[PDB]
Design a protein around this ligand. Structure first.
Ligand SMILES: CS(=O)(=O)N1CCc2c(c(-c3ccc(Cl)c(C#Cc4ccc(Cl)c(CNCc5ccccc5)c4)c3)nn2CCCN2CCOCC2)C1
Length: 220
């Protein structure tokens, strides 16, 4: 019933790859990237949403610590509570913790709700990515092989199911027998495959890719 491959870049639903730098804002980029695609599906415009906005404004009330980490679920909740989020163009990413400078005048997107998927269920994640859009997930990126990844289907034997780095699953496929998830990262274009990492799929929640998935929606 589901397609064998999906790639949301092919439907103009993914913005350019971003660069987080010294700031641990991966959670924030994961969140906006998920919302960006929902905005494209609804409005037909692809605009990069402000990760910085999340870092500066979705703080203690959402259990997040800006550059010292956070959560995509709580970020989606901030966007709901805030009744908006600014464009990246208006609230650019400065890779450090700042005061909250959200202005409703430059609101580029809204958020109605978000869904959390069951832990470790790669079948359920496969469906969400096909039926709903790119899904915010965490991975275990705490290995040298992650940093050193250049291409191919990434597989790390030491990889736990405990997540620590925010990424975005923009599709899935099969590279000569090896099933993978197509993962947008936030380390610039010089990381992996033009900023993307294809990661092992259906290998026992490898690197905890399906440990904490979630995606937002912008309802009519
Ligand atoms: C060790 S574990 O089992 O893998 N784990 C613990 C449980 C967990 C985790 C996550 C989760 C899911 C996706 C991602 Cl991308 C992340 C992450 C991360 C991250 C990103 C950058 C950084 Cl720099 C860090 C490192 N700092 C830790 C930190 C994390 C959050 C707040 C304050 C400090 C971590 C965590 N959600 N959750 C679910 C808990 C969410 N609760 C619900 C109530 O509101 C938020 C807290 C992690």
């Amino acid at each position: 019933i589901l397609p064998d491959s999906v790639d949301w870049r092919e439907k103009g639903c993914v913005t350019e790859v971003k660069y987080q730098g010294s700031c641990g804002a991966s959670w924030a980029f994961s969140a906006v990237g998920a919302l960006e695609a929902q905005l494209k599906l609804k409005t037909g415009k692809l605009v990069s949403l402000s990760a910085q906005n999340l870092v500066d404004c979705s703080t203690e009330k959402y259990g997040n610590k800006g550059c010292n980490g956070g959560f995509m679920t709580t970020a989606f909740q901030y966007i709901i509570d805030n009744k908006g989020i600014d464009s990246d163009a208006s609230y650019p990413y400065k890779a450090m913790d700042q005061k909250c400078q959200y202005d409703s005048k430059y609101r580029a997107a809204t958020c109605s709700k978000y869904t959390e998927l069951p832990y470790g269920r790669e079948d359920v994640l496969k469906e969400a990515v096909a039926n709903k859009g790119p899904v915010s997930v965490g991975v275990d990126a705490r290995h040298p092989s992650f940093f050193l990844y250049r291409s191919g289907v990434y597989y790390e034997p030491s990889c736990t199911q405990n997540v620590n780095h925010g990424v975005l699953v923009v599709g899935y496929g099969d590279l000569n027998g090896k099933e993978y998830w197509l993962v947008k990262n936030s380390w610039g274009h010089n990381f992996g495959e033009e900023g993307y990492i294809r990661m092992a799929r259906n290998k026992g929640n490898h690197c905890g890719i399906a440990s904490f998935p979630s995606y937002p929606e912008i309802l009519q």
